[PDB]
Ligand binder design. Sequence first.
Ligand code: NI
Ligand SMILES: [Zn+2]
Length: 198
Amino acid sequence: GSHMDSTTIQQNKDTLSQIVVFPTGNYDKNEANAMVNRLANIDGKYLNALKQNNLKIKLLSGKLTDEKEYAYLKGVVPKGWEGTGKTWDDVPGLGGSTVALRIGFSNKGKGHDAINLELHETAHAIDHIVLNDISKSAQFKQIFAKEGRSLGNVNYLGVYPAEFFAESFAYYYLNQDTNSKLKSACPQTYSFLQNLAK
Ligand code: NI
Ligand SMILES: [Zn+2]
């Protein structure tokens, strides 16, 4: 329960080798590997479900909107970003039906507000592809009504249950510190995530 983590990592990295796609061009290989390592903390059942659905986690060597598949987002303002002067050209990751992540932009504040980019975006894909939009469920709505402001960002996370779901998931899986902070701040959300993975 603490003594065999190497096996869980081995399995999840094997799964991730069948999900993660590295980009053409030049980028920091050690940082890309660090992102894969952090994703390996996510429960294997979710990662294997993404793999079954042929979801690829595309790591990017440049801006999101410079990829052909996301060019339609050039100049477009993300929800909740009205009034900022910023657009998707400035945003380093996206998740949902697909996952795309700029290498080097994991940490909070690297163009985004999540505790970790790759876990937040992948959580969106798990919500949508694996869990049938569980962030829209009546069960989660009740939890969100109570706890959805308690990770901060009250006018964004506290208003959009899919974002609160993705941020809570990132806290649950990033490290022991964030996991404990979620348990303290958002106990029903923590229990909800613990039971999903049982
Ligand atoms: Ni153990
Ligand atoms: Zn998001």
